[PDB]
Design a protein around this ligand. Sequence first.
Ligand SMILES: O=C(/N=C1/NC(=O)[C@]2(O[C@H](CO)[C@@H](O)[C@H](O)[C@H]2O)S1)c1ccc2ccccc2c1
Ligand SMILES: O=C(/N=C1/NC(=O)[C@]2(O[C@H](CO)[C@@H](O)[C@H](O)[C@H]2O)S1)c1ccc2ccccc2c1
Ligand SMILES: *Cc1c(COP(=O)(O)O)cnc(C)c1O
Ligand SMILES: *Cc1c(COP(=O)(O)O)cnc(C)c1O
Lengths: 807, 807
Amino acid sequence: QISVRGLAGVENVTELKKNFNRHLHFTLVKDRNVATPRDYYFALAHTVRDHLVGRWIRTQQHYYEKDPKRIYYLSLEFYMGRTLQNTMVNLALENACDEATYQLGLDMEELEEIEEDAGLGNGGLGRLAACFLDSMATLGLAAYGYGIRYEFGIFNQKICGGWQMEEADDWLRYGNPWEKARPEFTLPVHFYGRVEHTSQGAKWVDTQVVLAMPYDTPVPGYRNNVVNTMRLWSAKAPNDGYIQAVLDRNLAENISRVLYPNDNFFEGKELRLKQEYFVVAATLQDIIRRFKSSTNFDAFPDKVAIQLNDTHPSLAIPELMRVLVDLERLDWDKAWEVTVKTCAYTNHTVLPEALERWPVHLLETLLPRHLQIIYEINQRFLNRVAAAFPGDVDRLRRMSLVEEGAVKRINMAHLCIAGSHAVNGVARIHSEILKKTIFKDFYELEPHKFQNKTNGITPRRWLVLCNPGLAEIIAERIGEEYISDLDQLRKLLSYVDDEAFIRDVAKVKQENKLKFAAYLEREYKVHINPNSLFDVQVKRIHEYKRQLLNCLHVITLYNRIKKEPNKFVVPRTVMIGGKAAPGYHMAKMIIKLITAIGDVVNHDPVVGDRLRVIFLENYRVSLAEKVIPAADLSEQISTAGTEASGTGNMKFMLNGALTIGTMDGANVEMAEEAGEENFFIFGMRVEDVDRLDQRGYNAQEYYDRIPELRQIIEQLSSGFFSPKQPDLFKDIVNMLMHHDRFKVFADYEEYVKCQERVSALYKNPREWTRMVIRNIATSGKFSSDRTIAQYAREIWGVEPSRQRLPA
Amino acid sequence: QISVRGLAGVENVTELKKNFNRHLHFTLVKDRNVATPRDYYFALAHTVRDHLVGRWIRTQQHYYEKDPKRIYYLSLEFYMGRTLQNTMVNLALENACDEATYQLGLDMEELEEIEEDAGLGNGGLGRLAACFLDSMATLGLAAYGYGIRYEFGIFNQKICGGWQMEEADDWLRYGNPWEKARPEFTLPVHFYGRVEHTSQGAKWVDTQVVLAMPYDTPVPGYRNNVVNTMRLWSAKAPNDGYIQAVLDRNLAENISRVLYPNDNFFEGKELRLKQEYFVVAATLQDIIRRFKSSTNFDAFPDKVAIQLNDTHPSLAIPELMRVLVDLERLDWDKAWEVTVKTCAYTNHTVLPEALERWPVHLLETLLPRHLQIIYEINQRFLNRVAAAFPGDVDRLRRMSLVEEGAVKRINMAHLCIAGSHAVNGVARIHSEILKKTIFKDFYELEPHKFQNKTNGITPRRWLVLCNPGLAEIIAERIGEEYISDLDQLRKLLSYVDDEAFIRDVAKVKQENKLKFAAYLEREYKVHINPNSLFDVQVKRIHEYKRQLLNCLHVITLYNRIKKEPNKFVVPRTVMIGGKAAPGYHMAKMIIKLITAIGDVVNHDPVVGDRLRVIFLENYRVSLAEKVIPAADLSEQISTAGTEASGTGNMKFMLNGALTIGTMDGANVEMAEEAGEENFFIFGMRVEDVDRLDQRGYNAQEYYDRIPELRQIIEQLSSGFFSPKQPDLFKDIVNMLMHHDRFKVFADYEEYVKCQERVSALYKNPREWTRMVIRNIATSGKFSSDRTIAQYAREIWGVEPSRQRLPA
Ligand SMILES: O=C(/N=C1/NC(=O)[C@]2(O[C@H](CO)[C@@H](O)[C@H](O)[C@H]2O)S1)c1ccc2ccccc2c1
Ligand SMILES: O=C(/N=C1/NC(=O)[C@]2(O[C@H](CO)[C@@H](O)[C@H](O)[C@H]2O)S1)c1ccc2ccccc2c1
Ligand SMILES: *Cc1c(COP(=O)(O)O)cnc(C)c1O
Ligand SMILES: *Cc1c(COP(=O)(O)O)cnc(C)c1O
C-alpha cells in the first residue's frame, strides 16, 4: 500500500506464503481447519525469523574475521516491546508479509496484536537500552546487549474499583520465538564462600554455584543486513531428603525469576544484589572468553568497551579486577589501568532514594572477595584525593566509597566514577547538575572524565512503525533517507507554509485519533470525542513526574465549567496512564485519585463531552505505540531538576504533539531545537527551585493566595471525589500542604495559565498544525542514532558506519 | 547395509541431507564450522521429526472422522528411553538416515548416543507403559497415553566409594525435540476447598487452582503410518509482598517437578497424592471434552475405555463420579454404571508395602468432595456384599474401602475393584494369586471381573532396534513379517539342527559381547574377558529380586577357586546393575556389598580372568539396550510369589540368553513355552514358600547344615570384604539370619547346583546355542502386540488392525 513499508515483489510474496504454510504444518503441527489467530501469528513470526538467520550468522562471523572493538552494553533492563513488526520494518519485509498474509485470507495487523510485549524493563531506562540496541545495529557497531532473562517482566496492571492490581506478566506462556537458547554456553557464577590467602595469592573458596544459561535474541539494524545479539542470562541449578533436594533447586533459579518493579527507588534486597552480580559475573566471563578467542591484557581496552547503565552492574568493576588479579595474576596497578579504560558509567537519575548503597554486611556474606577489592580500590582512590587536596578531610569522607553510619554501606556511584574512564549524564542540564552538585568533588578531581550524552529514541519504532501515515507523507516530500538520518527532517521547515502539507499533517493526526478512539471503545468499552484535544500524560506514576499537578488542572477546568456552564471551552480528553511500584503507597493513591476524578467528571451531565478524564490501564510499550501518535498535547511537567532526561517527551515531539513542560531534562534541548515560541514552557527553572528551598517551601502560602487552588483542596478534604469515604485523600492533601518535595503548588498558577494558551492555539487549527510542523522538523537531534554516534566517538573510540553487509 | 533397516533410496537420501542442512541453519542457527555432535544430533532429530507430522495430523483427523472407541492408558510412569532410532525403525528410515549422515561425514550411531533417555519411570511398570504405547499404535488402536511431564525423571546413579549417589536427571536441559507444547489446551485442576450442599446439589468451592498444560509426544506404529499421542501434563500457576507472591508460584509448579523414585514402596506423601489427582483431573476433562466434540452419557462407555495402571490413578473413579453427578447432574446409579463400564484396573504387584492406603485426614483436606464420594461408594458396595453374604461381618470389614485403625485409611485397590468392570494381573500365576489370596473376597463376589493379561515387550525396541544382527539373520531365514507377528519365530525350530544358523546365532552373540566389552573399556575404563559367560542381573535393587542370592553364588565360586586354584572352571563375567530407592537402606547396602565383592574378586591374582564381578552403573533403558543383547545368562531369581510378571526376563529370552530362574511371574509361562528342558529352573515353588511360612522360616537351620554357606556368612561378619570396616555388613548378616522375608538361604543349595548345570552346558557351545535357538523360537507369546490384542478384545471391546493408513 505505502512507500516506506518496502516492496511486495511477486516472488517474495510467493515464498513467504509457502514458508508460512510450511511452519504452520511442520512447526506448529496444525492444519488450517484447527488453527487459531495465535497459530497464524506464530507461523508468521517463524517465517520472518528465518530471514534473520543468515544475516545473524554472517554478521557474527564478520565480527570474528575483522575483530573490531566490541561494545558491551550492560543493563538489568531491556524493554523491547513487540519484535515482529520491528523485524519486518528493518528487513524491508512489511508490505510483502502484508500482501502474503492478505492473500492467505489474514489481517496482519490483527496477528501483530497477539504478540506479547517483552516487558523486561520498568520504563525509560529499560526502553533506552532497547532504542540503543536498534541504533547500534543500524550504525554497524559490534555491540552486545547483556542482561537477565526474567521469567516475569513488569507486572500487568489491572484497575479494580479505581485501584491498581498487579498480575504476574507470564510473557513466556506460549513460548518466545525470538530467542535462541544456548545451553552449551552455560557458565558458572559463584556466591557466598570465603577468602583464603595463600603464597600464590587470594582464593575464593567454598562457594555456592549457580549456572548462567544464555538466550540470544537477534537485533536487526535498519536495512543494512547487520544483526547483533542481545544475550540474556537465565539462572539454572547445577546437577549435584531426595525429593526436597530436587525442589530446592528453585532457590537458585529464583535469581532470574522476576524483574524488580521499584523504579527510581532503591530497596536494598539481597535477591536484587544476586541479580546484579549474576549478570555481571556471567557477562564478564563471556567477554573474556570472546577476547581470548582471537596472556596479554594490555590490548583488552582496545578490543572491549563495557558500558554500565546506572550502578546496577557496578560490580563489573571489582569483578574485572578479581578476574585479572586472582585468576590471570596481573599486578593490581596494571589490572586497574585495564579496568578503568574498559569501563564507562552512565548516570540516569539524581533522585537520592534511587542511589544504591549496599550494606557492607550483605557484601561481606555474599561477595567477600569483592568487598576486599572495593576496600582496596577505596584506599588507593582516597590516597589520590589526599595528594590532590591535602588537608581536606571532609572531602575524603564525602568521596569515600564507604559510607559510615549505624550500618556501613558502599556507595556504588562512587565506585563507578572511580573505576570508569568516562561518566555521563543523559541530558545537558542533568550532566551539568552532575558536575555542579552531585559529583562536584569528583569533577574537581577528574574533570576530563565527565561528559554529556543527551538521550534519544529510535525513529524506526517511534515513527515508521507506530505512525506509518506520518512517515509516508514526510517521505513523499523528502524521501526515505531521514529514517536513518533524522536531521533531514529539518527540510520540512520549507513546507511550513505549504497548504497541502498542513492538510496532510492534520489529516494523519485526525486519523490516528479516530483509530485510537476506536481502540478505546472496542478493547475497553469507553466513548470519547475524537474532535477534543488529546491531552496525554503517560509515564510511570511518581511524585516527581507530578501527575498530581495535572490532576489539579483537570479539577480546575471542571470547576470553571460548573461555575459558567454555558461558556465555550475547548473540549479535552485528558488521558493519564502509568504503573505505580507495588509498595509505593502515594503513587497508588494518585492512580485512585485520577479514576475518582474521572468518576465525577465523566458522569456530570453539565460537562457533556467537553471534558473527559481517562486512566489508561496497563501502560507499556505496545500501548505507547498506539497513544503517542494520537496525542495533541504532551505533558512533561516534572519539577525542574528531577527528570534526568525523559524520552517519552521525544516520542511525542516526533509524532506531532505539542509539548507543555517545565525546563527539565531533555525538554530544555527540545525547546532549544524547536524554538521557545513553539513550545509551551512554564514553571520554575532549577535556579528558582533552589531559591525556594533556601527560603523554605511553604505550600500554605499558595493555598492562602489562590482561591481556585483553595477550592480544590477543600473539595479533596471534604470528600467531593470520595462520597462514601470522605477522608480517602487525606494523605494526598496532607502531603501537598506539609511535605511536598516536588512543589506542586509552586507551579500551579503558571501551569494553568500556560494551559489556557494551549487551548487558545488549538482553536486555530492551521496555526496549531504549523507549530506542530516546526516541532517534527526540529526533532532530528533526538534520534538515538545521534546519541549512539556520540557514545561511539567520544567514549568507546569506534567509528559508526552506514555501510551494508552482503545479504 | 542390512535388510531390516529399510531402503536407502537415492531421492530420499538427497532430501534427508538437504533437510538436515536446513535444520542446522534455520533451526539450530549454526554453520558446519562451529557445530558440535550435539548440534548434529538435533538436526537429525528435527529432520526425522518432520516425517511424523503429516502422519500425526492424518491419524488424529482420521480418529475424528471415524470416531472409534478411544483407549486412555493412565499411568504415573512412562519409561520411554530414546526416541530417535525407534522413530527411524518405525518409519522405515534407518538406512536412509544412516546413508544420508554417512554422506555428510557423520556416524549416526555416535549421534544416537547423545540423546538423553526420557526416564519418566522407575522400571518395569513405566517401561510396560512404553512398550504398550508402541503396540497400541502398531495395532491401529485409537489410544492415548496420559501422564505427568516430570521435570526430573528417575535420578542418575553415580557410584562413589562403592555407594550409590543420586543426581538430578535434568533431561530437559538441552530441550526435548519430541514434544509439542500445547499451552492452548491448558485445563484447571482444583485442590483443597470445602463442600457446600445446596438445593441443586453438592458444590466444591474455595479451591486453589493449579493449571495443567499438556505436552504431546508422537507415538509411531510400526510401518503402518499410525501416529498416536502420549499427552503429559505439566503444572503451571494461574496468573492471579509482590516479589514473594511471584516466587511462590513454584509451590504449585512443584507438582510436576519430580518422579517419586520409591518403586514398589508406598510412602504416603502429600505431593504424590497431588500428582495422582493432577493427572487424573486434567485427563478426565480432556477425555470428556473429546467425547462431547463428536447430554447423553449412556454412550460414554461405548466411546471411552480408561485403563488404570496400579492404584496410582484410582482417583479417576470418584473424579468421574464427581463430574457426572455434580457437574453433569446425572443420578448416582446411572453415573456409577457409566463409571464401572468405562474403567478397568490392572494390578502390577502384591507386595504389601506397595499397597496405597491414603490417610483419610489427607483426603479430607485435599479432596473433600472425593472423600464423600468414596464413602458413598463404600456404603453401596458393602450393602451389595451384605446381601450376597448375609451375616458375614468379617467379610464386610475385609472388603471395606475404609480401613479402621489408629489412622483411618482408604484402600485404593478396593476402590479400583469396586469401580471397574475388569481387574487383571500381569502373568498367569500372579492373576491366580489375586483370585486365591489377595482379592479372594472380591473374586467370590464378582468372579466375571477377574482376568489375566500376561505382560509383553515390544519386539521393535527389544529386538530390531537393540539387536540388528540377530534380527537380520532371522529375517534371512523367515522374512521380516515376524517383527509385527512375533509368533512366526516358531519357524526357527526347523533350523535348530541347521549348522549355518547355529554358527550365525553364536556369531551374533559373540559380536554383541565384543561390542559391549568395548563399551565397558571405553566409557567406563574396565577390562573383561569376552570369552567368559556373561552372567547378567539387571533390574531395580530390591530384597525380593534377591540380588543377595546372586551375591552368595558369586562368593561360592570365589571360595571354590581359592580352595582349588588349579582346577578348571568356566570363566564368568558376573554383571549386576540397578538403582536403589534413595531411602531404602538395605538396597543401598546390597549395592555396596556387590562393589565390595568386586574389589576382592577382581584383584585376586589367583582368580585371574576366570571370575569378574562388575556393578553396572546407572542402569536405564539405553543401557538395557546394550547389555541385554550381550548376555548369555539371564538371572530371574525372585522368591516365588513376589515378581508379578517381570519383563526383563522376556527381553533376555528374545535376545539369545538362557534363563536361570524361579517359577515366579512370567518365568512360569516362559518355561512352558520353551519347554522346561530348555530353561534352568530351580528353587521353591509358591506352594513350597507357603509350606515353609506355616512351619516358620528358620535361616539358622541352613547355616547349620551347609558348610559353604556358613563360610560365606563368617566371611561377611568377620570383615573379609570390608577390611577397614569389619562390621560394615552386620545389617545384611542380621537380616539374612533373623528377618529375611524372601528366604535367600532356602534356595541357596538348589541355586548353586543349577548354576553348575549352566556352566556344564556352556562348555558345549553347540548345545548351548541350540537351547538358545529353542528359547528365541518360542518367545513369540511375550510380544506386547499379543498382550494388547488381548486387552483390546477382552477388556476394551475393540478390534486391533494391521491395516495401514495412507502416508
Ligand atoms: O534509574 C532508575 N530508573 C530510571 N528510569 C528512567 O526512566 C531514568 O532513565 C531514563 C533514561 O536515561 C531517563 O530518561 C529518565 O529521566 C530517568 O528517570 S532512570 C532506576 C533506579 C533504581 C532502580 C532500582 C530497582 C529497579 C529499577 C530501578 C530503576
Ligand atoms: O508397582 C509398582 N512398581 C512396579 N514395578 C514393576 O516392575 C511391576 O510392574 C511390572 C509390569 O507389570 C511387573 O512386570 C513387575 O513384576 C512389577 O514389580 S509393579 C510401584 C508401586 C508403588 C509405587 C509408589 C511410588 C512410585 C512408584 C511405585 C511403583
Ligand atoms: C518512552 C517510555 C517511557 C519513558 O517515558 P518518560 O515520559 O520519559 O518517563 C516509559 N514507559 C514506556 C512504556 C515507554 O515507551
Ligand atoms: C525391562 C526393564 C525393567 C524391568 O526389569 P525386571 O527385570 O522385569 O525388573 C527395569 N528397568 C529397565 C531400564 C528396563 O528396560
